[PDB]
Amino acid sequence: SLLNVPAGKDLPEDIYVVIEIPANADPIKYEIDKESGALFVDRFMSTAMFYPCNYGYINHTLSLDGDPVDVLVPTPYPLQPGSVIRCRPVGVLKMTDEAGEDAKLVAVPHSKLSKEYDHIKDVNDLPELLKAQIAHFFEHYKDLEKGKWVKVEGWENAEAAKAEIVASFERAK
Amino acid sequence: SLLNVPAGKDLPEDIYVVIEIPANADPIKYEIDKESGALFVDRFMSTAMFYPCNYGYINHTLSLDGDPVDVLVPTPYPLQPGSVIRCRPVGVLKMTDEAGEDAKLVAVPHSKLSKEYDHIKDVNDLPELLKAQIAHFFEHYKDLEKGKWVKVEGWENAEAAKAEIVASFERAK
Amino acid sequence: SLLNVPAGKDLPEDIYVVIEIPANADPIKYEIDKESGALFVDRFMSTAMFYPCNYGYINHTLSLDGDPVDVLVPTPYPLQPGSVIRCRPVGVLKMTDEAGEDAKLVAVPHSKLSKEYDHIKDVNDLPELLKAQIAHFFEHYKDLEKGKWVKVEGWENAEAAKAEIVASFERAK
Amino acid sequence: SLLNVPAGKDLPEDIYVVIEIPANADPIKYEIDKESGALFVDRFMSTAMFYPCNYGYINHTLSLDGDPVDVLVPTPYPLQPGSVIRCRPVGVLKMTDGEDAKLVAVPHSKLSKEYDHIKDVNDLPELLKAQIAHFFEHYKDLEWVKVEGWENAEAAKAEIVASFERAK
Amino acid sequence: SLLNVPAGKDLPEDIYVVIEIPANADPIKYEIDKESGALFVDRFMSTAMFYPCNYGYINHTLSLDGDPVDVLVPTPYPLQPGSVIRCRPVGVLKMTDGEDAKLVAVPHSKLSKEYDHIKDVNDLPELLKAQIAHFFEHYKDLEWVKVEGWENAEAAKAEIVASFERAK
Amino acid sequence: SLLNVPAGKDLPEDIYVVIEIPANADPIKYEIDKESGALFVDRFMSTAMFYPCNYGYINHTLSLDGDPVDVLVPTPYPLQPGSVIRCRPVGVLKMTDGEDAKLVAVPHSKLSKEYDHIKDVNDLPELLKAQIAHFFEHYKDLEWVKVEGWENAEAAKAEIVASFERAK
């Protein structure tokens, strides 16, 4: 089951991300139940927006918010909700919402799966448009939800990202 | 696995439905094997029709036909086969086929996932067109299958639906 | 889980095939991890080609290459990656790659699921165009991958196919 | 522009069919406006059904009901509404609702060889023929038709010719 | 050909809307070239958003900004870019970026009954009305607009009439 | 109407490309009929391959093979068959089957900035350039071509100019 998926081959350089929401999909926010490993519908997004990247999490990680580390993974084509992709950390989007601090990692597919992201070694190597869309997205997707708000603080490098993976992995024990 | 999915949070008001066939999909009738929890192809429908709603079942229920209670769930967008959605009972379509009596529940997404179905508290609140299409569908999808026939008897309220859920849940023990 | 799926109802006549790649899909090569039963992204194909059939494997089989027997399954509509379909053996495509000998079976949906393939009792009954596309595909999909090469040797009948299923099934014990 | 398309290269064997509705598509019934040649939305179908084949007409034809000869064209993939496809007549589904007829035509061999074996109505897959009948029999239920039967390639050609001359 | 489409059967109650952008589609902003009538790619949207409704214009109309009256049309399924749909005005979303207005129209009852109950702007689903405002408010962020509010069916008709006469 | 589209705003730097085949679509080869301007089905491809880019031509051009200059245009999302997109030439893939050439053009900066960095053929992603070569090299296998190589933006412009003047 997805529950048995490893955090990665060689953390924090080599990780697996369990996909929950494909890029460019209909406004359905899926989430993998951590008890059954099944794909649950979290909710139908209220805004007319779509995820700019595939969104998921790293298994066997535990962050301060109590949940696993979530990651955005750009790929040539949208992935199946519930699939596992091997990728590597390149940065982190830092923000704050009605609950407190939030941080989402950005990771690109591993060289074994494609050589299109080999030159992307850090947050500053990602296409600027993409970065702008990701920020804009998180900053506005919950707008039609009363009580929820998001403020994008900024981006951090691969080091900070790998830092979060290792911290959260050790903490998950 | 899907096999471990609960019948619901608070039966019969709050239930989870395991989706097998998305709305508006290609003529493939999927079914979750109750032994493996895997999605099996039951058959390729012979008629040029499509399910008007997402179709699935409530786990941990056992009706008189020997199988779990099946439900039709309307949503804004088609759901992934094998996903679990939290919804609530609003009515039941009663019919008879070559095997005997058959009844399929209609349930709408729970308020947590969307507020579009809050005003739909009973079978009589559902759009008439939708009800007509659901009946028409079940009454004709097996037409090109020799030996199978369906006759729609009628609709019943939320009470009758919740009655079926509770009966079948207790019976599943 | 998919890991618990049987090789078939009555080998080698009646088998189940676990689907990994749907026909006519985007260039993503999926693969079911044999440890978790989860769907992993193997890689993004480099060529501008798509699988002519649904591609998967028979569970509980072990061939000489160390992996389960893989099968190509034509259907009216593309199947969900990770679904299980009941079909029957009609032939085998024989070829050789940079690793050595390779053979892929062709199987058509079982009569229970559809009556469109009943007249297809052997490799020679398959549409010639289809056979040409399958061969062409395997012969060129890895062209943009340095080190990999494929040479199609030829087709064999239902007998040879059933032979491979039985050998690999017994060997998997 | 779509209005300027000919009935075909060589009636009634070789014809051009203007596609209005694609096979396996959403229940939106489009129709080319004979005045502008633009694609109009005729109506949203009310039954949960889809056309088992692409659906269109042969331009420059006039059947007794005042409309051009309409045809169903099976293809390996759905065509674009408003595209034109070269085919050859293979049969006609007769029915009554007055009297109505829908021809079946397959892609001309210049576009594909997948249909060379289908010379007549009987050559068409039984299931396909059965899905077409059922569809036309039931798609207007929530709004009626009775399927009379199938007629041959010659009958199909006869309908094309009559309607074409009749259009002149 | 698309240029030859009329403003409608009976302005301002019964109108034809030429669809340029489908609902829920990829972020590609198309626009019909008023000179050729062909479908041009205006630009690729930079925000991760999609039109909650089909978007187009009423031919033969001229608003103050030199363009025809643009309309948003909700349908059960996305329409084809370049298709024409018969509708009836139900409201207008006002905003400023000069001043801008976007009418909302629903499918004419001849195409569907699903909207007969929507006689006015208030009849439209609150969420739908809220997604339209937010979209127009935020889709050009990465390239600005301020939503003033919603006006009624009468206001909508008034805009159609003025722009139509103004086009003459 | 599609016949009335110009070759571009400013040849050979700024050109309009009429798209006939979308990127990543079903193996249906469409082509705009130069007589009606309607979208015709040329044939159903027999190989399991798809165009890695949108494919079309520059209207009002006449290459030596009697056809207009054909172009491949990479976009973030597949375009609609029959739409027109403003681009700028960046290269040309040469081959022999007589001699054949296919220009590559990217979206004009007015539509997107995602391609401003691609000034020449070498600027195009190696993989993309490699998928285009392989595709044209193998798509007609089940029905032949040999890829000669890639030429620059200047070579591309030269082809546009010659064919345009030649069309006059």
PDB file of N, CA, C and O in Angstrom, chain B residues 1 3 26-28 30 33 35-45 80-81, chain C residues 1-2 4-6 16 75-80 82-85 109 112-114:
ATOM      1  N   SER B   1      -5.933  -0.263   2.649  1.00  0.00           N
ATOM      2  CA  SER B   1      -6.599  -0.655   1.381  1.00  0.00           C
ATOM      3  C   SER B   1      -8.037  -0.203   1.462  1.00  0.00           C
ATOM      4  O   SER B   1      -8.546   0.059   2.551  1.00  0.00           O
ATOM      5  N   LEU B   3     -10.445  -1.925   1.383  1.00  0.00           N
ATOM      6  CA  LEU B   3     -11.135  -2.914   2.201  1.00  0.00           C
ATOM      7  C   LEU B   3     -11.251  -2.474   3.657  1.00  0.00           C
ATOM      8  O   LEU B   3     -12.145  -2.908   4.378  1.00  0.00           O
ATOM      9  N   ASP B  26     -16.035   6.504 -19.957  1.00  0.00           N
ATOM     10  CA  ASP B  26     -16.153   5.579 -21.076  1.00  0.00           C
ATOM     11  C   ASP B  26     -16.920   4.367 -20.567  1.00  0.00           C
ATOM     12  O   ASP B  26     -16.917   4.084 -19.365  1.00  0.00           O
ATOM     13  N   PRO B  27     -17.567   3.629 -21.471  1.00  0.00           N
ATOM     14  CA  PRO B  27     -18.356   2.444 -21.137  1.00  0.00           C
ATOM     15  C   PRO B  27     -17.645   1.245 -20.469  1.00  0.00           C
ATOM     16  O   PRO B  27     -17.865   0.092 -20.868  1.00  0.00           O
ATOM     17  N   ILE B  28     -16.809   1.499 -19.463  1.00  0.00           N
ATOM     18  CA  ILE B  28     -16.129   0.420 -18.752  1.00  0.00           C
ATOM     19  C   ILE B  28     -16.766   0.317 -17.376  1.00  0.00           C
ATOM     20  O   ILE B  28     -16.792   1.297 -16.630  1.00  0.00           O
ATOM     21  N   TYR B  30     -16.315  -0.856 -13.896  1.00  0.00           N
ATOM     22  CA  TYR B  30     -15.324  -1.327 -12.937  1.00  0.00           C
ATOM     23  C   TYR B  30     -16.019  -1.831 -11.680  1.00  0.00           C
ATOM     24  O   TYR B  30     -17.146  -1.466 -11.381  1.00  0.00           O
ATOM     25  N   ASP B  33     -12.743  -5.677  -6.314  1.00  0.00           N
ATOM     26  CA  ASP B  33     -12.785  -7.062  -5.859  1.00  0.00           C
ATOM     27  C   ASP B  33     -12.795  -7.027  -4.337  1.00  0.00           C
ATOM     28  O   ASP B  33     -11.900  -6.436  -3.728  1.00  0.00           O
ATOM     29  N   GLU B  35     -11.903  -9.177  -2.312  1.00  0.00           N
ATOM     30  CA  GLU B  35     -10.881 -10.000  -1.691  1.00  0.00           C
ATOM     31  C   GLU B  35      -9.545  -9.302  -1.695  1.00  0.00           C
ATOM     32  O   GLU B  35      -8.810  -9.340  -0.711  1.00  0.00           O
ATOM     33  N   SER B  36      -9.231  -8.658  -2.810  1.00  0.00           N
ATOM     34  CA  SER B  36      -7.963  -7.971  -2.955  1.00  0.00           C
ATOM     35  C   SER B  36      -8.058  -6.474  -2.724  1.00  0.00           C
ATOM     36  O   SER B  36      -7.060  -5.833  -2.375  1.00  0.00           O
ATOM     37  N   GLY B  37      -9.251  -5.918  -2.935  1.00  0.00           N
ATOM     38  CA  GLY B  37      -9.444  -4.488  -2.790  1.00  0.00           C
ATOM     39  C   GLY B  37      -9.014  -3.796  -4.076  1.00  0.00           C
ATOM     40  O   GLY B  37      -9.003  -2.561  -4.167  1.00  0.00           O
ATOM     41  N   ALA B  38      -8.645  -4.598  -5.073  1.00  0.00           N
ATOM     42  CA  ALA B  38      -8.200  -4.084  -6.365  1.00  0.00           C
ATOM     43  C   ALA B  38      -9.390  -3.789  -7.282  1.00  0.00           C
ATOM     44  O   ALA B  38     -10.471  -4.348  -7.110  1.00  0.00           O
ATOM     45  N   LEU B  39      -9.164  -2.918  -8.260  1.00  0.00           N
ATOM     46  CA  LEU B  39     -10.171  -2.504  -9.230  1.00  0.00           C
ATOM     47  C   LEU B  39     -10.120  -3.443 -10.431  1.00  0.00           C
ATOM     48  O   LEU B  39      -9.115  -3.504 -11.151  1.00  0.00           O
ATOM     49  N   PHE B  40     -11.188  -4.206 -10.599  1.00  0.00           N
ATOM     50  CA  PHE B  40     -11.326  -5.169 -11.672  1.00  0.00           C
ATOM     51  C   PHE B  40     -12.261  -4.634 -12.724  1.00  0.00           C
ATOM     52  O   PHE B  40     -13.176  -3.878 -12.424  1.00  0.00           O
ATOM     53  N   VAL B  41     -12.037  -5.039 -13.965  1.00  0.00           N
ATOM     54  CA  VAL B  41     -12.912  -4.643 -15.055  1.00  0.00           C
ATOM     55  C   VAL B  41     -14.015  -5.689 -14.990  1.00  0.00           C
ATOM     56  O   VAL B  41     -13.731  -6.886 -14.994  1.00  0.00           O
ATOM     57  N   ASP B  42     -15.251  -5.252 -14.782  1.00  0.00           N
ATOM     58  CA  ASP B  42     -16.365  -6.189 -14.730  1.00  0.00           C
ATOM     59  C   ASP B  42     -16.757  -6.511 -16.165  1.00  0.00           C
ATOM     60  O   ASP B  42     -16.957  -7.675 -16.516  1.00  0.00           O
ATOM     61  N   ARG B  43     -16.868  -5.475 -16.987  1.00  0.00           N
ATOM     62  CA  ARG B  43     -17.203  -5.642 -18.390  1.00  0.00           C
ATOM     63  C   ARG B  43     -17.289  -4.314 -19.126  1.00  0.00           C
ATOM     64  O   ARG B  43     -17.295  -3.246 -18.513  1.00  0.00           O
ATOM     65  N   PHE B  44     -17.279  -4.390 -20.457  1.00  0.00           N
ATOM     66  CA  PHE B  44     -17.430  -3.215 -21.292  1.00  0.00           C
ATOM     67  C   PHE B  44     -18.925  -3.171 -21.604  1.00  0.00           C
ATOM     68  O   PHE B  44     -19.494  -4.134 -22.130  1.00  0.00           O
ATOM     69  N   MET B  45     -19.583  -2.102 -21.172  1.00  0.00           N
ATOM     70  CA  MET B  45     -21.006  -1.945 -21.408  1.00  0.00           C
ATOM     71  C   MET B  45     -21.253  -2.015 -22.896  1.00  0.00           C
ATOM     72  O   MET B  45     -20.453  -1.523 -23.696  1.00  0.00           O
ATOM     73  N   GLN B  80     -12.106   9.974  -9.268  1.00  0.00           N
ATOM     74  CA  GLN B  80     -11.225   8.878  -9.661  1.00  0.00           C
ATOM     75  C   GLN B  80     -11.814   7.540  -9.250  1.00  0.00           C
ATOM     76  O   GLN B  80     -12.334   7.410  -8.146  1.00  0.00           O
ATOM     77  N   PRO B  81     -11.752   6.529 -10.124  1.00  0.00           N
ATOM     78  CA  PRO B  81     -12.301   5.234  -9.714  1.00  0.00           C
ATOM     79  C   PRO B  81     -11.411   4.829  -8.550  1.00  0.00           C
ATOM     80  O   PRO B  81     -10.192   5.046  -8.604  1.00  0.00           O
TER      81      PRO B  81
ATOM     82  N   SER C   1      -4.511  -5.817  -1.975  1.00  0.00           N
ATOM     83  CA  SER C   1      -3.565  -5.030  -2.807  1.00  0.00           C
ATOM     84  C   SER C   1      -3.364  -5.776  -4.103  1.00  0.00           C
ATOM     85  O   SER C   1      -3.651  -6.970  -4.183  1.00  0.00           O
ATOM     86  N   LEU C   2      -2.799  -5.093  -5.086  1.00  0.00           N
ATOM     87  CA  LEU C   2      -2.533  -5.711  -6.371  1.00  0.00           C
ATOM     88  C   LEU C   2      -1.601  -6.910  -6.208  1.00  0.00           C
ATOM     89  O   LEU C   2      -1.654  -7.863  -6.990  1.00  0.00           O
ATOM     90  N   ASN C   4      -1.835  -9.209  -4.146  1.00  0.00           N
ATOM     91  CA  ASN C   4      -2.614 -10.394  -3.813  1.00  0.00           C
ATOM     92  C   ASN C   4      -3.462 -10.914  -4.962  1.00  0.00           C
ATOM     93  O   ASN C   4      -4.156 -11.920  -4.828  1.00  0.00           O
ATOM     94  N   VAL C   5      -3.397 -10.239  -6.099  1.00  0.00           N
ATOM     95  CA  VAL C   5      -4.177 -10.644  -7.260  1.00  0.00           C
ATOM     96  C   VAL C   5      -3.684 -12.006  -7.806  1.00  0.00           C
ATOM     97  O   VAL C   5      -2.477 -12.259  -7.918  1.00  0.00           O
ATOM     98  N   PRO C   6      -4.619 -12.939  -8.054  1.00  0.00           N
ATOM     99  CA  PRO C   6      -4.258 -14.260  -8.574  1.00  0.00           C
ATOM    100  C   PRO C   6      -3.777 -14.190 -10.007  1.00  0.00           C
ATOM    101  O   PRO C   6      -4.074 -13.234 -10.723  1.00  0.00           O
ATOM    102  N   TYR C  16      -5.628 -13.138 -15.362  1.00  0.00           N
ATOM    103  CA  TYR C  16      -5.903 -11.748 -15.020  1.00  0.00           C
ATOM    104  C   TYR C  16      -4.615 -11.027 -15.372  1.00  0.00           C
ATOM    105  O   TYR C  16      -3.542 -11.595 -15.220  1.00  0.00           O
ATOM    106  N   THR C  75      -8.283  -3.291 -25.929  1.00  0.00           N
ATOM    107  CA  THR C  75      -9.621  -3.131 -25.381  1.00  0.00           C
ATOM    108  C   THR C  75     -10.284  -2.011 -26.171  1.00  0.00           C
ATOM    109  O   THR C  75      -9.607  -1.267 -26.901  1.00  0.00           O
ATOM    110  N   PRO C  76     -11.613  -1.876 -26.046  1.00  0.00           N
ATOM    111  CA  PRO C  76     -12.303  -0.816 -26.771  1.00  0.00           C
ATOM    112  C   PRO C  76     -11.848   0.550 -26.258  1.00  0.00           C
ATOM    113  O   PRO C  76     -11.563   1.448 -27.048  1.00  0.00           O
ATOM    114  N   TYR C  77     -11.760   0.697 -24.937  1.00  0.00           N
ATOM    115  CA  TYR C  77     -11.347   1.957 -24.322  1.00  0.00           C
ATOM    116  C   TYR C  77     -10.172   1.722 -23.397  1.00  0.00           C
ATOM    117  O   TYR C  77      -9.990   0.624 -22.892  1.00  0.00           O
ATOM    118  N   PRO C  78      -9.339   2.753 -23.185  1.00  0.00           N
ATOM    119  CA  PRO C  78      -8.165   2.667 -22.311  1.00  0.00           C
ATOM    120  C   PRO C  78      -8.609   2.338 -20.908  1.00  0.00           C
ATOM    121  O   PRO C  78      -9.649   2.832 -20.460  1.00  0.00           O
ATOM    122  N   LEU C  79      -7.819   1.515 -20.220  1.00  0.00           N
ATOM    123  CA  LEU C  79      -8.106   1.101 -18.859  1.00  0.00           C
ATOM    124  C   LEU C  79      -7.316   1.944 -17.870  1.00  0.00           C
ATOM    125  O   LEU C  79      -6.347   2.591 -18.231  1.00  0.00           O
ATOM    126  N   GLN C  80      -7.743   1.937 -16.616  1.00  0.00           N
ATOM    127  CA  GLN C  80      -7.068   2.679 -15.555  1.00  0.00           C
ATOM    128  C   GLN C  80      -5.759   2.007 -15.178  1.00  0.00           C
ATOM    129  O   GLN C  80      -5.704   0.786 -15.066  1.00  0.00           O
ATOM    130  N   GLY C  82      -3.342   0.279 -13.019  1.00  0.00           N
ATOM    131  CA  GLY C  82      -3.613  -0.382 -11.748  1.00  0.00           C
ATOM    132  C   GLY C  82      -4.903  -1.193 -11.682  1.00  0.00           C
ATOM    133  O   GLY C  82      -5.291  -1.633 -10.593  1.00  0.00           O
ATOM    134  N   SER C  83      -5.601  -1.354 -12.807  1.00  0.00           N
ATOM    135  CA  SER C  83      -6.823  -2.144 -12.805  1.00  0.00           C
ATOM    136  C   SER C  83      -6.457  -3.558 -13.243  1.00  0.00           C
ATOM    137  O   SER C  83      -5.388  -3.768 -13.823  1.00  0.00           O
ATOM    138  N   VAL C  84      -7.322  -4.525 -12.943  1.00  0.00           N
ATOM    139  CA  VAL C  84      -7.080  -5.912 -13.311  1.00  0.00           C
ATOM    140  C   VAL C  84      -8.145  -6.360 -14.306  1.00  0.00           C
ATOM    141  O   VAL C  84      -9.338  -6.221 -14.046  1.00  0.00           O
ATOM    142  N   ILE C  85      -7.716  -6.887 -15.448  1.00  0.00           N
ATOM    143  CA  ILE C  85      -8.649  -7.361 -16.469  1.00  0.00           C
ATOM    144  C   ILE C  85      -8.491  -8.867 -16.740  1.00  0.00           C
ATOM    145  O   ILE C  85      -7.384  -9.412 -16.751  1.00  0.00           O
ATOM    146  N   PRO C 109      -9.523  -9.462 -24.177  1.00  0.00           N
ATOM    147  CA  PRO C 109     -10.500  -9.541 -23.085  1.00  0.00           C
ATOM    148  C   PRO C 109     -11.322 -10.852 -23.150  1.00  0.00           C
ATOM    149  O   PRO C 109     -11.616 -11.362 -24.228  1.00  0.00           O
ATOM    150  N   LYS C 112     -16.688 -12.992 -21.052  1.00  0.00           N
ATOM    151  CA  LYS C 112     -17.565 -12.450 -20.028  1.00  0.00           C
ATOM    152  C   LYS C 112     -17.614 -10.921 -20.080  1.00  0.00           C
ATOM    153  O   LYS C 112     -18.678 -10.334 -19.903  1.00  0.00           O
ATOM    154  N   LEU C 113     -16.473 -10.285 -20.352  1.00  0.00           N
ATOM    155  CA  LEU C 113     -16.397  -8.825 -20.398  1.00  0.00           C
ATOM    156  C   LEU C 113     -16.814  -8.195 -21.724  1.00  0.00           C
ATOM    157  O   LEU C 113     -17.143  -7.010 -21.767  1.00  0.00           O
ATOM    158  N   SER C 114     -16.739  -8.963 -22.806  1.00  0.00           N
ATOM    159  CA  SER C 114     -17.075  -8.466 -24.138  1.00  0.00           C
ATOM    160  C   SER C 114     -17.043  -9.612 -25.133  1.00  0.00           C
ATOM    161  O   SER C 114     -16.237 -10.531 -25.002  1.00  0.00           O
TER     162      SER C 114
END
